[PDB]
Design a protein that fits this description.
It is classed as cell cycle/ligase. The structure holds two protein chains of two kinds. Chain A is of the alpha+beta class. Chain A has one helix at residues 27-37, and strands spanning 3-9, 15-21, 44-48, 51-52, 69-74. Chain A has a single domain, classed as Ubiquitin-like (UB roll) (Roll). Chain B is globular and about 50 Å long. The chains are: A alpha+beta, B alpha+beta. The complex binds sodium ion.
Amino acid sequence: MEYIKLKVIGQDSSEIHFKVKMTTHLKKLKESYCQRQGVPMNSLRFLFEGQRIADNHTPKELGMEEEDVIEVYQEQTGG
Amino acid sequence: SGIALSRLAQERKAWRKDHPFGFVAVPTKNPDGTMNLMNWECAIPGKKGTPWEGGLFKLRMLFKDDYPSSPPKCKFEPPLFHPNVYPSGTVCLSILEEDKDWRPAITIKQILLGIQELLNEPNIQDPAQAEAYTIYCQNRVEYEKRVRAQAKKFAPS
Ligand code: NA
């Protein structure tokens, strides 16, 4: 868009902000977020408008925009 | 490094599930709540039934971006009296060398356990600390005395 700022928010109200291309698979964003939390990739789920974000979803596909929010949750919860 | 961080996340998850009693291993949390898995603050309990018993010895564990193909560096803070710990606190141990006995399959649990065992049974093939070493070999009595005073110094109180 070419890059949009996406916000990832957890239960604690903490935010981490990513600049991503609309074109790029959201796996990289997920991967980085997990890294910043020090937890495996398979332990967190990311939702946009209440729907799970797949590894091969792109911001273009899901219709995302500047400053949109992704909510992150523990799988299960587990993990 | 994705490879290093993905493995250290597995390590941390497994530690949280189950680790040996008395051992501590906590990755460094940044002021902002985010994690630095390349630097872990640890503690080793002195082995039971030995002059080390009762001591809880802090060791820092530092990982490089080529972890797990590379070993961590393991540093006692403060340095300990022991033949195989350099005056720096850095542990001399073969599983902490790619060219000796480090392999990717070695976990943080096995590292900490490896070092706890080393504390108790020194390798006389590696004098890292010449005065601890000389006393170990030539005056076991004074050695044991210093070991017990040091365990006592680092006993939770
Ligand atoms: Na090495």
